[PDB]
Each structure stands twice: as structure tokens, then as C-alpha cells.
């Protein structure tokens, strides 16, 4: 049933989340983000926060080119940042791809 | 697993889908009062507005920076399901 509740959030939010994995010590989730404007990216949570990891490398050189004029240029960093931001970002990002 | 998931989703999209259930239904709450209570059936999209449980303060502060149409139960394809989820986000502030 938790197939069907990820299928909602893809259309309703734009994000599906593929896979969970607690490796290290954080659970990471691999995330991916459209509308055809496609931002890939991992959250990992080591809480002491959220580590954010551009995944850029099923990304053609056009698509790089036109996120890059979309997306501010440290979505394409690594970051770190608390819970109370992670819609602030997933806005920001959301807002970027129009 | 699959409820950290949905917690991710909460906080990640600021929407929760309480549960899931002819057709697929759904108990969502959108928000952060300010928070739009409402389900989703798939038969082409069916929005269904739940005013069912909010005070006359609440029912006016949304009445306030709502689109009309989002107290009025209607359909629409699922192409701009979320097209429709950025006003409601955007409109609660």
C-alpha cells in the first residue's frame, strides 16, 4: 500500500523517494525531483543535520546547462542544514524548476 | 520503513496523507490556523474540500486567502494536480 501513497506525493508534490538505507551512521534517502527539468539528489540525517548531495551524473550536459539557470548555484554543492528548512529547500528547489 | 517515508514527505512537502483507501480516497491536511483538510479520489482527479471539523474563525481565516473554488468540491486531470498544490501552499503563506 505504501506503493500507492508514493505514486500521490509524485504527482501532487512533484519528489518520489526510491530508496532508504542507514549506512555510516545516517539514514540516506535517495530523492528525485521534476515537473521535463529532473534534479536528483540524496538526504542523508547524521543530527548533531540533514546532508544534501546533488546527483548530477544521470544529468545530460543540456539538462546541467538549464538547471544551472534555474537552480541556485550551490544546489549543486554539498550542504547541511536542519529539519526546520527542509521544506524552505524543497520549495526553493521546486520554485527553481518552474 | 515505509512511515519514515511519509514523515519525510510531511515535513518535505508540508502535507500529510493520514491514510489511503470505489476509487481511491485519501485524508490529506495541507499546512504548517491555517491548514486546508481535504481528500483526494482517482476516478481524472476529485478534490473534496473537508470544513467538516474547522471553527468559524478558521473556516474565515481560510475564506480569506483562499481561491473560492477551494471550498467547492471539483475535478480536474491529474496533469495539474500539482499546479493545484502550489496555490494551496502558497495561499495558506
Redesign the interface.
Given at each position: 500500500?505504501?506503493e500507492?501513497?508514493?505514486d500521490?506525493?509524485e504527482?501532487?508534490?512533484?519528489?518520489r523517494?526510491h530508496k532508504?538505507y542507514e549506512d555510516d551512521s545516517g539514514?540516506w534517502?535517495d530523492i528525485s525531483q521534476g515537473?521535463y527539468s529532473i534534479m536528483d539528489y540524496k538526504?542523508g540525517f547524521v543530527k548533531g543535520e540533514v546532508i544534501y548531495a546533488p546527483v548530477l551524473k544521470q544529468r545530460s550536459t543540456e539538462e546541467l546547462y538549464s538547471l544551472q539557470s534555474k537552480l541556485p548555484e550551490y544546489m549543486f554543492e554539498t550542504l547541511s542544514f536542519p529539519?526546520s528548512s527542509?521544506?524552505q529547500f524543497?520549495?526553493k528547489i521546486?520554485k527553481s524548476l518552474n
Open positions: 500500500n505504501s500507492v501513497i508514493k500521490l506525493y504527482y501532487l508534490c512533484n519528489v523517494v532508504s539514514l534517502f515537473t538526504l529539519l527542509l521544506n524543497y520549495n521546486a
